[PDB]
Short mmCIF file of C-alpha atoms and ligand atoms in Angstrom, two decimals:
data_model
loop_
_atom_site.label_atom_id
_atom_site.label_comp_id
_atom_site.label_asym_id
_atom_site.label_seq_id
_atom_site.Cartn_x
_atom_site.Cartn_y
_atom_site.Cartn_z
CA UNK A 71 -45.35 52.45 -57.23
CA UNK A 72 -49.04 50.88 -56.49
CA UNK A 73 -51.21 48.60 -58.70
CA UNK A 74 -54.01 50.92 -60.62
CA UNK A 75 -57.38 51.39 -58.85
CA UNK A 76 -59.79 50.68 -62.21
CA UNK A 77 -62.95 50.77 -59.89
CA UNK A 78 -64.11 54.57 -58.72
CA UNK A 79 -66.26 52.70 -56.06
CA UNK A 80 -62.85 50.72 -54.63
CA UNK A 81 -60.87 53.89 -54.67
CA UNK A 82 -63.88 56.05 -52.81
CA UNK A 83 -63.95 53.40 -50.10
CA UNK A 84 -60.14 54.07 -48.43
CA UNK A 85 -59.47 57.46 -50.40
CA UNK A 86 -56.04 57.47 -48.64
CA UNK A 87 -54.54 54.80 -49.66
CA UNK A 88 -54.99 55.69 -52.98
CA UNK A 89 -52.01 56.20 -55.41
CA UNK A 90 -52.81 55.16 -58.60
CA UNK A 91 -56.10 55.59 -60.34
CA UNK A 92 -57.04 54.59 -63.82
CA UNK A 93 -60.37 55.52 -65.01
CA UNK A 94 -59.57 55.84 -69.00
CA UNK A 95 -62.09 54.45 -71.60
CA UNK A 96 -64.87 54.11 -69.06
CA UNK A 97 -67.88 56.13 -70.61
CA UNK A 98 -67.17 58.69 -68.01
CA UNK A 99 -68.93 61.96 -68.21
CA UNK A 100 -67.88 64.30 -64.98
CA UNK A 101 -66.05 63.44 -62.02
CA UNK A 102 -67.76 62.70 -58.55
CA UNK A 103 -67.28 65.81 -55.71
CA UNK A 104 -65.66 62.86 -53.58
CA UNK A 105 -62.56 62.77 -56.12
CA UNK A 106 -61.40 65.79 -53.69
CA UNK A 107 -60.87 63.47 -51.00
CA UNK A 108 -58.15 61.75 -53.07
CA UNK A 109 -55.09 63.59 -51.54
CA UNK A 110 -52.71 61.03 -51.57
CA UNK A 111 -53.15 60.72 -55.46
CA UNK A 112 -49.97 60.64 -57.45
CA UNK A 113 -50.76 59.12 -61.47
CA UNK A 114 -54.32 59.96 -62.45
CA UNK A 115 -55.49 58.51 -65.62
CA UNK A 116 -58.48 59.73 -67.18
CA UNK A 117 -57.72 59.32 -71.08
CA UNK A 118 -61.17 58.05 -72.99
CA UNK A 119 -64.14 59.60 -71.38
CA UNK A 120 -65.29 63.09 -72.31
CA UNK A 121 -64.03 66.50 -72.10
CA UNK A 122 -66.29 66.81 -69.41
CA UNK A 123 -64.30 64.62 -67.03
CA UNK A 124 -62.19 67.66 -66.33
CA UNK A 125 -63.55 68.51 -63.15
CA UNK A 126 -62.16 71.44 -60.93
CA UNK A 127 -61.25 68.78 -58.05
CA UNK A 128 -58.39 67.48 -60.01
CA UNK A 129 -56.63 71.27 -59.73
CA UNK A 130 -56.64 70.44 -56.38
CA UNK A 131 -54.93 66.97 -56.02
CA UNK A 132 -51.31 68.82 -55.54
CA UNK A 133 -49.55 65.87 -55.27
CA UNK A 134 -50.17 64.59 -58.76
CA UNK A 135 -46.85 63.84 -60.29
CA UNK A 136 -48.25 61.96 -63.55
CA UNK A 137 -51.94 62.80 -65.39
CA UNK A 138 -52.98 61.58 -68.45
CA UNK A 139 -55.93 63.50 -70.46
CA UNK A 140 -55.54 61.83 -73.74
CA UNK A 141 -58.91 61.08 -76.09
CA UNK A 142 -61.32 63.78 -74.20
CA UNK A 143 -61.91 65.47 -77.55
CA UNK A 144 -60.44 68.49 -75.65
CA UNK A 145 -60.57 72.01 -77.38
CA UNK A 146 -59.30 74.08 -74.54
CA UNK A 147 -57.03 73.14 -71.47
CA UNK A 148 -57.94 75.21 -68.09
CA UNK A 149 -55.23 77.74 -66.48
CA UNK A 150 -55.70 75.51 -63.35
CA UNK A 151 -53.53 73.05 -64.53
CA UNK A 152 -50.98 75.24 -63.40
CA UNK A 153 -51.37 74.94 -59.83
CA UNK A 154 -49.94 70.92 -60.14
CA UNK A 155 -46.35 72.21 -59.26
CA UNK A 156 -45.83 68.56 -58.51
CA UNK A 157 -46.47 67.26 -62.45
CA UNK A 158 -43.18 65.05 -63.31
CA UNK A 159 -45.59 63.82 -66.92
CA UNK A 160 -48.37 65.34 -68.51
CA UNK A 161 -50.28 63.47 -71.47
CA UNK A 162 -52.52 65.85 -73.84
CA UNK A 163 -52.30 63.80 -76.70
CA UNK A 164 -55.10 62.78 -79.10
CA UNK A 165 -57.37 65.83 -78.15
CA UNK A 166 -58.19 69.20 -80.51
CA UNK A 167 -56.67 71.73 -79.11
CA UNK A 168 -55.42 74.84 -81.27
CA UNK A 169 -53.53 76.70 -78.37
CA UNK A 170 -52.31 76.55 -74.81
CA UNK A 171 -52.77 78.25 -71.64
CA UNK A 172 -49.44 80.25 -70.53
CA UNK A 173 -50.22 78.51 -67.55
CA UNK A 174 -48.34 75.10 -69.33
CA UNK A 175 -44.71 76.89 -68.37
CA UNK A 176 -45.58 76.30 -64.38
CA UNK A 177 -44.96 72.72 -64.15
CA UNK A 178 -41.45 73.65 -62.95
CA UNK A 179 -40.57 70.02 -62.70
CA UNK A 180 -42.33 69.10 -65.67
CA UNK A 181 -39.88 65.83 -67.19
CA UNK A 182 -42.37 64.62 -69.92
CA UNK A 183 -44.54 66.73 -72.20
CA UNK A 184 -47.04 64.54 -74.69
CA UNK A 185 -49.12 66.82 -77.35
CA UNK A 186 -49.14 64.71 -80.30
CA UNK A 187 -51.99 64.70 -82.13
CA UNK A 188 -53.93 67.93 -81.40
CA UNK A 189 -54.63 70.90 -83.96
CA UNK A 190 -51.33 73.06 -82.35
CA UNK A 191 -50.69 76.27 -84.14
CA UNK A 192 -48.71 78.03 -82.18
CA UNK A 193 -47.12 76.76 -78.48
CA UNK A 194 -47.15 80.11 -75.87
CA UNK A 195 -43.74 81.62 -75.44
CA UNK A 196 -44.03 80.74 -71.41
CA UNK A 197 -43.01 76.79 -72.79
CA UNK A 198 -39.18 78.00 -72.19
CA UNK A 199 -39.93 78.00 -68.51
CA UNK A 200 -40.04 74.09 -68.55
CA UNK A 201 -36.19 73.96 -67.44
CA UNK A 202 -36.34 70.41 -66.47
CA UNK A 203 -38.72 69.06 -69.85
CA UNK A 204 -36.55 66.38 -71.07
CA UNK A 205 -39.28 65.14 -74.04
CA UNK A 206 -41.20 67.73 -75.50
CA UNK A 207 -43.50 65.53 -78.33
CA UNK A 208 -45.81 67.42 -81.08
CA UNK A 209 -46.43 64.26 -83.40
CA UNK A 210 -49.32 65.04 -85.90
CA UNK A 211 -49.86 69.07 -84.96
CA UNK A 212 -50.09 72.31 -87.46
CA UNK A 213 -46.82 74.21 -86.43
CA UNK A 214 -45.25 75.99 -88.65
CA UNK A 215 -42.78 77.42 -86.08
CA UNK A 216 -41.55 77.14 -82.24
CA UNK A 217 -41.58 80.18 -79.75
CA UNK A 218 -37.51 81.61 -79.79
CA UNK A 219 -38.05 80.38 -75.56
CA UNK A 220 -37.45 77.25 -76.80
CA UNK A 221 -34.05 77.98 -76.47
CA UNK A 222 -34.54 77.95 -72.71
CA UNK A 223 -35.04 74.21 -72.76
CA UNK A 224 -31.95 73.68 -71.03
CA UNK A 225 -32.56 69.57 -70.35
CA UNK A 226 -34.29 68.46 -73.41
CA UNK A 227 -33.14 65.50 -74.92
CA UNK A 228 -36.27 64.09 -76.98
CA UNK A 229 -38.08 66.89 -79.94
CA UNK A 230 -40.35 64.84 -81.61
CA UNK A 231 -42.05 67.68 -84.41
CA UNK A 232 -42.65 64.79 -87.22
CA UNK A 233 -45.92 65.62 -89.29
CA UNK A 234 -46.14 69.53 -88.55
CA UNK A 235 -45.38 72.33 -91.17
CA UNK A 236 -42.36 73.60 -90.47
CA UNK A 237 -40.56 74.87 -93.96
CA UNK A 238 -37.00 75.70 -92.01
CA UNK A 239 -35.44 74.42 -88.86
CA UNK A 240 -34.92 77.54 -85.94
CA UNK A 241 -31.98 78.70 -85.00
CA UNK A 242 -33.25 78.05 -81.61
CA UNK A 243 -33.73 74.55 -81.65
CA UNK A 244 -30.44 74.03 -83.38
CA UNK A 245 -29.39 76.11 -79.35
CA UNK A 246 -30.46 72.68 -77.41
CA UNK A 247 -27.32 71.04 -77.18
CA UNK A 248 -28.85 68.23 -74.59
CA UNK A 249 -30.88 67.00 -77.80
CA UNK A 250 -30.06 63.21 -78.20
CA UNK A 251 -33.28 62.57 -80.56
CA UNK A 252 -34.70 65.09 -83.06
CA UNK A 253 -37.44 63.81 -85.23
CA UNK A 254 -38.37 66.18 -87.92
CA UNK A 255 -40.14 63.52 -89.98
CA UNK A 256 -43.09 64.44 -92.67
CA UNK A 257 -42.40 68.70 -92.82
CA UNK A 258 -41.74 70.66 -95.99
CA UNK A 259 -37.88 70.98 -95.26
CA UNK A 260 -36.27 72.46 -98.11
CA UNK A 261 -32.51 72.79 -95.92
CA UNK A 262 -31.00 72.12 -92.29
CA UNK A 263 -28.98 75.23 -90.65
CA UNK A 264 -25.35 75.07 -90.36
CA UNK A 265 -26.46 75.99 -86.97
CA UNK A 266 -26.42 71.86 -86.73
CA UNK A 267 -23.14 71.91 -85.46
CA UNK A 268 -24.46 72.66 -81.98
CA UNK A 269 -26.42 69.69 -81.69
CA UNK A 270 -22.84 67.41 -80.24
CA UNK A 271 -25.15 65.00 -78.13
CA UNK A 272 -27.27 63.87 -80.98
CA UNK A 273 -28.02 60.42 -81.18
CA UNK A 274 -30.81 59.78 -83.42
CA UNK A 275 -31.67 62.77 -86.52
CA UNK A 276 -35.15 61.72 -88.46
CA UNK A 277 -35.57 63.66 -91.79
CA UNK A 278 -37.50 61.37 -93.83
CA UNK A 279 -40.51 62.64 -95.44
CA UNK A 280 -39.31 66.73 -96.52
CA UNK A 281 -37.62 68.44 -100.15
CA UNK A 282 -33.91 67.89 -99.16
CA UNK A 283 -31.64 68.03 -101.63
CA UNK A 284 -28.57 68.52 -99.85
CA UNK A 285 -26.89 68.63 -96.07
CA UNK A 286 -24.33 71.51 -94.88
CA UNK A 287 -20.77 70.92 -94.03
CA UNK A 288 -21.35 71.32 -90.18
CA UNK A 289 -23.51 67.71 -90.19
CA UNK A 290 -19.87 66.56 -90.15
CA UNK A 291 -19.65 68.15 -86.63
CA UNK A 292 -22.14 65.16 -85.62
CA UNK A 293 -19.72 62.77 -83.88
CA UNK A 294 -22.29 61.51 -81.34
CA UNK A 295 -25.15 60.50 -84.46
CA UNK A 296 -25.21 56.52 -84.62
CA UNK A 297 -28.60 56.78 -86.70
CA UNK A 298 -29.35 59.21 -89.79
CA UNK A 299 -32.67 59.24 -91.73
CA UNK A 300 -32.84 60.59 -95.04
CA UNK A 301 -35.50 58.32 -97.00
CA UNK A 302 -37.75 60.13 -98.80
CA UNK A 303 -36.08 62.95 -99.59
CA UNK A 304 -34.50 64.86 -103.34
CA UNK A 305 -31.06 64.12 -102.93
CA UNK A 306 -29.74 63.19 -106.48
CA UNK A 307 -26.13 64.39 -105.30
CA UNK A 308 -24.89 61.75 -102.68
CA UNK A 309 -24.37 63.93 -99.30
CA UNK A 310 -20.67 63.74 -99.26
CA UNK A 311 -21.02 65.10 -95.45
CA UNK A 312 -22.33 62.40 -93.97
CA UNK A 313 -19.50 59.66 -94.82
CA UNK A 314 -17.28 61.52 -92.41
CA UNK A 315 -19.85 60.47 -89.20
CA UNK A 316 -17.09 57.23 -88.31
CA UNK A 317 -19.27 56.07 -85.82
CA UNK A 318 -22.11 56.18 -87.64
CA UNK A 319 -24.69 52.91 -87.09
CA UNK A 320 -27.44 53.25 -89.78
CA UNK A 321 -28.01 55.26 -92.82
CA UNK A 322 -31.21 55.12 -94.54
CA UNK A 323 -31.33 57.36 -97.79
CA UNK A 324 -34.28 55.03 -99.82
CA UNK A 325 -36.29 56.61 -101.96
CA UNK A 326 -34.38 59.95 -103.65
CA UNK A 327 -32.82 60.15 -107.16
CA UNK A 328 -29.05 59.13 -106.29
CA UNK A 329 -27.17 58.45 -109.28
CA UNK A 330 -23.68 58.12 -107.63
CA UNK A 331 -22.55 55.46 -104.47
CA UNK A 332 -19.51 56.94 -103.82
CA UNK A 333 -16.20 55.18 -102.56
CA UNK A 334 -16.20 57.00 -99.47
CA UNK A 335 -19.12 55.14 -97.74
CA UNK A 336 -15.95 53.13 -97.19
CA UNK A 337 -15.23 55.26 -94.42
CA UNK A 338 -18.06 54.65 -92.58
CA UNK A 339 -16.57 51.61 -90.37
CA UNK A 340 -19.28 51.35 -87.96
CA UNK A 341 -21.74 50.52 -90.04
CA UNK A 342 -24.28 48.22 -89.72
CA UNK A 343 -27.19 48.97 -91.45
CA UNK A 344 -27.69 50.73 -94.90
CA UNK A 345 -30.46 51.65 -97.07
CA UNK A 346 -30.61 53.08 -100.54
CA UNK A 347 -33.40 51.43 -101.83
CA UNK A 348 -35.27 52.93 -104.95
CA UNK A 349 -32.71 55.22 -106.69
CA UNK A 350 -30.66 55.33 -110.33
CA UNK A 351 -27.37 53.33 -108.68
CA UNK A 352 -25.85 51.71 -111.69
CA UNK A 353 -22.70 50.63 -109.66
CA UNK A 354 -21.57 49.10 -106.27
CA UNK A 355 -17.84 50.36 -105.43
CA UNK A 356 -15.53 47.72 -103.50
CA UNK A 357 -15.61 50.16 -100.37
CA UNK A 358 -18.60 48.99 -99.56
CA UNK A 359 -17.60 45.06 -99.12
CA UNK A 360 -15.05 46.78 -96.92
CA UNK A 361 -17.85 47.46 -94.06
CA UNK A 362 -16.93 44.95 -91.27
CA UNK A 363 -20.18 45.11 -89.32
CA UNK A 364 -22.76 46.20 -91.64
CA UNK A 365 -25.58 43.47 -91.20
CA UNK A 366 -28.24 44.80 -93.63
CA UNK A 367 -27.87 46.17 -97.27
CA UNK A 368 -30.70 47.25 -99.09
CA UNK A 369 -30.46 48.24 -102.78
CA UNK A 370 -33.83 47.04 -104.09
CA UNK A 371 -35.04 49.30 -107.47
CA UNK A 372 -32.31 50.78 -108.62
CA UNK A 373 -29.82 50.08 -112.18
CA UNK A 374 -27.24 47.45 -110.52
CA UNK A 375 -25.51 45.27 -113.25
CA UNK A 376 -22.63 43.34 -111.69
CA UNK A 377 -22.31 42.57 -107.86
CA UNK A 378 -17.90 42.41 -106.92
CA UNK A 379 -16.00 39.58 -106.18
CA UNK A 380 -15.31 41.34 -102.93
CA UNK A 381 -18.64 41.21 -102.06
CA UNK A 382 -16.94 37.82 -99.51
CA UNK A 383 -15.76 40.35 -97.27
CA UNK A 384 -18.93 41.50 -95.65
CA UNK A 385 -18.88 38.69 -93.21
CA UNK A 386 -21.44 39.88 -91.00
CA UNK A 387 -24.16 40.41 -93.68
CA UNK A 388 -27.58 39.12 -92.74
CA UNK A 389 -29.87 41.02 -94.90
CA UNK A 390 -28.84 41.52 -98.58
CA UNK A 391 -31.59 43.00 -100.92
CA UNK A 392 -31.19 43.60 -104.92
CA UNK A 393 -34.63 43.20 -106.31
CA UNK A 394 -35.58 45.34 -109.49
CA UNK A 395 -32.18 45.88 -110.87
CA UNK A 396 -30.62 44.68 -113.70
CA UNK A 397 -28.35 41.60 -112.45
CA UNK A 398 -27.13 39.13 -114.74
CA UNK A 399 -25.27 36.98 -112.55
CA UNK A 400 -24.02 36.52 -108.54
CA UNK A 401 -20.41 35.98 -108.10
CA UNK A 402 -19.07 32.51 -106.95
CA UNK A 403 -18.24 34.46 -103.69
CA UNK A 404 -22.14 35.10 -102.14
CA UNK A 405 -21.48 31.91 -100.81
CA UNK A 406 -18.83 33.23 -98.04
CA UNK A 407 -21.91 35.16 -96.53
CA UNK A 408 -22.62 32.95 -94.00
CA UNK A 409 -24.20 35.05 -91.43
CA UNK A 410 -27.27 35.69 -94.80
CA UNK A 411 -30.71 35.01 -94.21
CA UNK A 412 -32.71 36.94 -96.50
CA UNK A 413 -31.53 37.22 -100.22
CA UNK A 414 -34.38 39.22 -102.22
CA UNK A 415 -33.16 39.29 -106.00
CA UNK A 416 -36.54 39.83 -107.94
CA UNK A 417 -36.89 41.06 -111.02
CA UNK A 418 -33.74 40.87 -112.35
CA UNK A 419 -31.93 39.01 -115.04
CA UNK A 420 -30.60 35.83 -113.71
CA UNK A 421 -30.89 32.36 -115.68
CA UNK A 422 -28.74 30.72 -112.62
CA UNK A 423 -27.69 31.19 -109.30
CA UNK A 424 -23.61 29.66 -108.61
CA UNK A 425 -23.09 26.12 -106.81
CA UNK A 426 -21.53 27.88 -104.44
CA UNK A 427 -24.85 29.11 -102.67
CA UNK A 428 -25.27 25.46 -101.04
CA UNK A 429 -22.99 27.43 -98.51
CA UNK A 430 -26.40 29.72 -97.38
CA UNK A 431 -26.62 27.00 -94.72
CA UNK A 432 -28.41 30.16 -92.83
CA UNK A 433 -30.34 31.33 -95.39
CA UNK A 434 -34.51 31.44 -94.65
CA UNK A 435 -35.38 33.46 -97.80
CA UNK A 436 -34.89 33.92 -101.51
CA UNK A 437 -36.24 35.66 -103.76
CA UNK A 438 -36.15 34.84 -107.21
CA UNK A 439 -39.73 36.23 -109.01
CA UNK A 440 -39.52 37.64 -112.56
CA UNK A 441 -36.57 36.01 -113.18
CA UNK A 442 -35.63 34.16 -116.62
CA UNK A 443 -35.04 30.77 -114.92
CA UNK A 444 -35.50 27.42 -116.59
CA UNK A 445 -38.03 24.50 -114.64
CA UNK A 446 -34.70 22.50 -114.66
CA UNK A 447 -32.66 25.27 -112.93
CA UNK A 448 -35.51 25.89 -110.50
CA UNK A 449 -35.27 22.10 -109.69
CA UNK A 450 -31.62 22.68 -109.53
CA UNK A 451 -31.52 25.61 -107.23
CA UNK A 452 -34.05 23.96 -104.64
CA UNK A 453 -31.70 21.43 -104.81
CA UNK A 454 -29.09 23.42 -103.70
CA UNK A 455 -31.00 24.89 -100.65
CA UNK A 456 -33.51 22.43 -99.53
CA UNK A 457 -34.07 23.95 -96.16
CA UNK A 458 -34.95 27.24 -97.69
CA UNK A 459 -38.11 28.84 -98.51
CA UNK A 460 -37.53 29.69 -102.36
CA UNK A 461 -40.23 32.04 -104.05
CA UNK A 462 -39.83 32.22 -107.96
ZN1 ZN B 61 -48.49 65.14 -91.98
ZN1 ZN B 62 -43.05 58.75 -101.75
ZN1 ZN B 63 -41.19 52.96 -107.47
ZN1 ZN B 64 -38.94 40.83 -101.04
#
């Protein structure tokens, strides 16, 4: 690993010893003839000049294990690319380019792939050569669907296809059981395969942003998933499936028409983080105290009346959010959250908060806008938490 070379002149003077050269965002038009004499080169950086800078010297450098070509407003990538067998990461993104040469499936130890933000209809059916791609990313491209190759991706673990087209999943991504991340964020998804199933090393699933209105059975089958990523969505019927993921870390399902918070979110032990923030929840079942670990709860704009007594239990709670609801009162027991620092309860109904909220030593925030409380009970509740910033 060497130090960059950000001076062309420097590098030209003892080509040999040169490793490393980064010669992004310099107002660089072409590439000097002497560049050939760079045959030690391993990470060439070239991101920021013009698509011009793509001279046939770099074709060349074979032992080129990293190059980045990001921001060179390019519209078509040379077959010559090809002949860097050596290419471990290859950067494309922030270019326009519509298609790509079949030549992209020869980097046969290819590790990191980088094509967000480009104009990507289609990806050529020679992308199921990459055997060792473990990140493939297509952030911010026109795809409506992947080649069925893809199912060749025998070591990917990262499929980042967030803001693209796609209206279904494949059947042949739902084939790459090495997946640990799959980010499907901002598509048109109307359903997810029961083909899901397959996917036993997932980590990390990212729907938010599509036309969901419901999961399959087989997302039960998701043992490894810590994080899950529904915001955004049409679910009015709580996904039943997903309260039997045990191990289960975060669950964010803000922003869909829920009417129901079942009793069997009790279930999910692991817990530590949970979002359902702007929905038609009226009420908050005891199972939910019952989360040992959960550390945030966010239920902001939604039809919440009454918060439990057993609300004491949630130890661990750090984040508790119940703005634009319909609360008339906090139970005695808020004060046994010690671990709370943020309390947003704006917009609500509440003439008084409980003595017992002098216990908040740790509280930092709270939120208490739009609220029908009296100058006197302001004076009160300040009183209460001195060290607190207190917004009403
Ligand atoms: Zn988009
Ligand atoms: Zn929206
Ligand atoms: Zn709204
Ligand atoms: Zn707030």
């Amino acid at each position: 690993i060497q130090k960059p070379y950000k001076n062309l002149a420097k590098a030209l003077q003892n080509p040999a010893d040169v490793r490393n050269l980064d010669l992004s965002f310099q107002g660089l038009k072409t590439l000097p003839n002497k560049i050939g004499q760079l045959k030690n080169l391993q990470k060439l950086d070239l991101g920021g000049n013009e698509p011009t800078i793509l001279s046939k010297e770099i074709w060349q450098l074979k032992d080129l294990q990293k190059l980045n070509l990001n921001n060179n407003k390019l519209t078509v990538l040379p077959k010559e690319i090809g002949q860097l067998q050596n290419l471990q990461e290859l950067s494309l993104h922030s270019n326009e380019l519509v298609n790509l040469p079949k030549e992209i499936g020869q980097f046969k130890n290819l590790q990191k792939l980088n094509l967000d933000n480009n104009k990507l209809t289609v990806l050529p059916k020679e992308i199921g050569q990459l055997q060792n791609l473990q990140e493939l990313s297509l952030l911010s491209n026109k795809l409506i669907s992947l080649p069925t190759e893809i199912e060749q991706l025998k070591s990917l673990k990262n499929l980042d296809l967030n803001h693209n087209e796609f209206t279904t999943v494949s059947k042949e991504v739902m084939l790459l059981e090495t997946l640990e991340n799959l980010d499907l964020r901002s598509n048109k998804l109307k359903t997810i395969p029961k083909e899901i199933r397959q996917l036993k090393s997932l980590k990390v699933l990212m729907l938010t942003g599509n036309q969901l209105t419901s999961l399959p059975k087989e997302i039960e089958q998701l043992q490894n998933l810590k994080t899950l990523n529904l915001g955004e969505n049409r679910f009015q019927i709580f996904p039943v499936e997903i309260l039997e993921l045990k191990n289960l870390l975060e669950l964010n399902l803000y922003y869909n028409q829920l009417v129901e918070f079942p009793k069997e979110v009790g279930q999910l032990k692991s817990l530590k983080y949970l979002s359902l923030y702007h929905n038609q929840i009226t009420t908050l079942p005891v199972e939910v105290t019952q989360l040992p670990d959960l550390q945030e709860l966010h239920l902001s704009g939604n039809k919440i009346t009454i918060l439990p007594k057993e609300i004491l239990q949630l130890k661990n709670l750090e984040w508790l959010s119940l703005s634009n609801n319909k609360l008339n009162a906090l139970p005695k027991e808020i004060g046994q959250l010690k671990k709370l620092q943020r309390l947003e309860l704006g917009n609500n109904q509440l003439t008084t908060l409980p003595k017992e909220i002098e216990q908040l030593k740790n509280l930092q925030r709270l939120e208490l806008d739009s609220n029908p409380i009296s100058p006197k009970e302001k004076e009160r509740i300040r009183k209460l938490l001195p060290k607190c910033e207190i917004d009403f």
